Every structure is written in structure tokens, then in C-alpha cells.
């Protein structure tokens, strides 16, 4: 679910995840999920959260999704001795660091909104928090 | 015996499956 | 004397007074004698043209005395009747169906004056308009 259509390379380094997010501001919407936590979001995670949040406001309103995966995350097969090559691509994920906005919402009642994000938050591996756009 | 080698085992499971493909459709 | 000892309200049509699917358990029964009610209501059937609901007090004492005490007929069924739908709102109230004169449901609303319990005549007639959106239709305004 939701991976880049084309890629500059088949594989990529583990890297690190030090730092704080830029996307601390609700933009496309008016209501949002700021991250607070730090970690990985697998594509199936953001998807399950999206479903759980979609069946909430139903068809009315709108949901922007800020994060996108592109970080391949490979693994070795079930029981192979170490190091005869780096493993094949397994599942894409989107790394996150605190302050990150996750989901954004269109014209929906704020209480229904807290219902929606209260639903969607449970699927996420990381902790979250509700936020509002601010005029400036 | 188990031994821990990878290809030494999947041959056996391959036989075990290859028979079931016949025995099912019969 | 609106304090009935054992009421079971049930609006009735002009068409019959003693069958079973309309009158009976639907209006309940306990000392009730519908067998005479066929001789009772149908004069009120004869008062005006048939095929309409006629709301009616089910006056019921434990003293064996009981009477129909007719209410003047509801505006909503009358509006489905005039609009001519043979079902209901069906489609959402966003799509209006009925089409009636504006003086109507005010010369038609006035018909219900015996059961209209507001004070101001126009607030009352507007209560009949609430009965109008009750159908999911709205008379031209």
C-alpha cells in the first residue's frame, strides 16, 4: 500500500534519525496530528490508520496525508548465515521525528474530529497529539 | 536430521509438496 | 375532561369501523365493544368524503362507558393526499415534491383550528407548515 512508483536505487542505508521535524504546522487542513514521538511508520500502519479514520467522518470532509514512505527497509530470509549479501526489499516505511504533522482534515466538526483522530491514533506505533492551524 | 543448512531442507519440502500436487487431483 | 382512564389512541380511516387489521388490538380491547362501534363511527364516515384518516379520542373509562371523540384530521396525510404521492417522502427532503397554494395551508390550515393549540393564528398555521416539512415536501412560500 502506497510506495513510490519509481526509485533512484533499489536499496538504501539504515542511516539514523536524529533531529526535529519541519512540518509542525497544519496546512492543507485545519485539524491535525502532531507526532511528539520518534520512529518508523510502515505503509500498512499509515494505511490502517487511514481506514480507521476514513470510516469516521464518512464521505463528508477531507483528509490530507502529509507523510510518505520512501525508505525501503530490507531483511534477510528466515534462517541464513550472516553476510552473503544485503537483503532484498521488504516493505517501505516513512521515518518520523517529533513535531511532525501526520494527518490533516477539512471542514469537519472539531468534536467529531477528535473522535476521528482518537480512532486513527491507536493504529500508529508512535504516540500522537491533536492540533489546530493557528492564524499565523 | 536437521543440520541447519538451507538447501538441504527445501528439497525435502519440495518433494513433500510435489507429491501432494498429484495426490490431490487424483 | 382530557384524562382518560385507559386510553389506547389510534387514528382511524373513514372506510370501516369493525374489521380486525384496523380496529381491534391496534386500538386494544378490554371491555371495548366495537360491534356497536360499527354503528357509531360510520355516521362520521357519512359526514364527509371517505379515504382519509380521522384522528379520534379513544374515550375509555373503567365504567364501561366509552366513546370515539373525533379529532380534526392531520395536515400531513392531507398534504400527501393533495400532492398525490402514493408512497411517502422516498427521496430526501432536499427534493421537495408537493405543490399547493400559499393561501392554502392557511385556509386549509384553518380546518384544524379545533386541534391547533398555539395562540397566534400565524404561528399555528406555521405549525401546520412544520407538519408540511414533516412530509419532506414544502409548500410554495
Amino acid at each position: 500500500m502506497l510506495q513510490p512508483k519509481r526509485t533512484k536505487f533499489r536499496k538504501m542505508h539504515k542511516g539514523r534519525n536524529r533531529g526535529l521535524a519541519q512540518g509542525t504546522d497544519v496546512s492543507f487542513g485545519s485539524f491535525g496530528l502532531k507526532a511528539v514521538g520518534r520512529g518508523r511508520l510502515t505503509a500498512r500502519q499509515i494505511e490502517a490508520a487511514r481506514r480507521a479514520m476514513t470510516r469516521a467522518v464518512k464521505r463528508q470532509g477531507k483528509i490530507w496525508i502529509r507523510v510518505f514512505p520512501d525508505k525501503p527497509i530490507t531483511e534477510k530470509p528466515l534462517a541464513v548465515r550472516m553476510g552473503k549479501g544485503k537483503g532484498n526489499v521488504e516493505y517501505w516505511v516513512a521515518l518520523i521525528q517529533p513535531g511532525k504533522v501526520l494527518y490533516e482534515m477539512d471542514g469537519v466538526p472539531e468534536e467529531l474530529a477528535r473522535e476521528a483522530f482518537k480512532l486513527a491514533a491507536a493504529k500508529l506505533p508512535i504516540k500522537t497529539t491533536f492540533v489546530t492551524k493557528t492564524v499565523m | 536430521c536437521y543440520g541447519g543448512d538451507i538447501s538441504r531442507k527445501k528439497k525435502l519440502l519440495q518433494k513433500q509438496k510435489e507429491g501432494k500436487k498429484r495426490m490431490k487431483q487424483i | 375532561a382530557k384524562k382518560v382512564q385507559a386510553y389506547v389512541k389510534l387514528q382511524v380511516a373513514a372506510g370501516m369501523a369493525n374489521p380486525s387489521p384496523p380496529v381491534g388490538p391496534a386500538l386494544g380491547q378490554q371491555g371495548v365493544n366495537i360491534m356497536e362501534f360499527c354503528k357509531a363511527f360510520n355516521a362520521k364516515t357519512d359526514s364527509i368524503e371517505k379515504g382519509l384518516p380521522i384522528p379520534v379520542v379513544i374515550t375509555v373509562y373503567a365504567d364501561r362507558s366509552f366513546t370515539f371523540v373525533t379529532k380534526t384530521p392531520p395536515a400531513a396525510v392531507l398534504l400527501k393526499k393533495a400532492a398525490g404521492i402514493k408512497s411517502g417522502s422516498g427521496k430526501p427532503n432536499k427534493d421537495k415534491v408537493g405543490k399547493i397554494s400559499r393561501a392554502q395551508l392557511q385556509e386549509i390550515a384553518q380546518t384544524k383550528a379545533a386541534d391547533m393549540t398555539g395562540a397566534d393564528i400565524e404561528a399555528m398555521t406555521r405549525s401546520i407548515e412544520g407538519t408540511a416539512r414533516s412530509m419532506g415536501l414544502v409548500v410554495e412560500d
Binding site: 526535529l20 521535524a21 509542525t24 502532531k34 507526532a35 511528539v36 517529533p98 513535531g99 497529539t129 493557528t134 492564524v135 499565523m136 | - | -
Partner: protein, 94 residues
């Protein structure tokens, strides 16, 4: 209509700034006009209360300090990355 407490800063740089932010204060420079910029150590809770109204971002508003009645408009707000707290705010004169 808004009115604001103030005192001149002397300490500056990341260390002193943290020593303020931990202490329920935050930095906020004030400039505008031809004259030199002047940083101010605002209290936190006060401003955090007052700013919550939207008009605070647009209303002309004073900042009391040494009786000079600085009278300024908001220009920028550094909100904390994930807490209901503030960091730093720009106050351009008007």
C-alpha cells in the same frame, strides 16, 4: 488594545536563552524604525494566555518597558515543536 510586561535582556546566546525558557520566560526582539534592535525577556504564561485570541496577531499593541511604550505588531512566532509553549517572537513597530 493589548499591553505587555517587559525588561531589557543582557544575556544572549543559546545557553542564556535556555536558562530563560526553562524559567517560564521567552526571548523576543523588538525593532522597526531606523534605530537599533532591542531584545526583550517576556514572561511565558501571560503572553501565552493573551495570544490565544486571534486578534492578537493583528491588533496594534503596546509593550511596556521603561515607560517608552514600544507599541508594536506581531511579525513571527516560534512555537515549540510539540508542546503548548513558546520560544521566540518578532515585534515590528507600527
Amino acid at each position: 488594545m493589548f499591553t505587555i510586561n517587559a525588561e531589557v535582556r543582557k544575556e544572549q546566546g543559546k545557553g542564556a536563552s535556555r536558562r530563560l525558557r526553562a524559567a517560564n520566560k521567552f526571548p523576543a526582539i523588538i525593532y522597526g524604525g531606523k534605530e537599533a534592535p532591542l531584545a526583550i525577556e517576556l514572561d511565558h504564561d501571560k503572553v501565552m494566555n493573551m495570544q490565544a485570541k486571534a486578534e492578537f496577531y493583528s491588533e496594534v499593541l503596546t509593550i511596556v518597558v521603561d515607560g517608552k511604550e514600544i507599541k508594536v505588531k506581531a511579525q513571527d512566532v516560534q512555537r515549540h515543536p510539540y508542546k503548548p509553549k513558546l520560544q521566540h517572537i518578532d515585534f515590528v513597530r507600527a
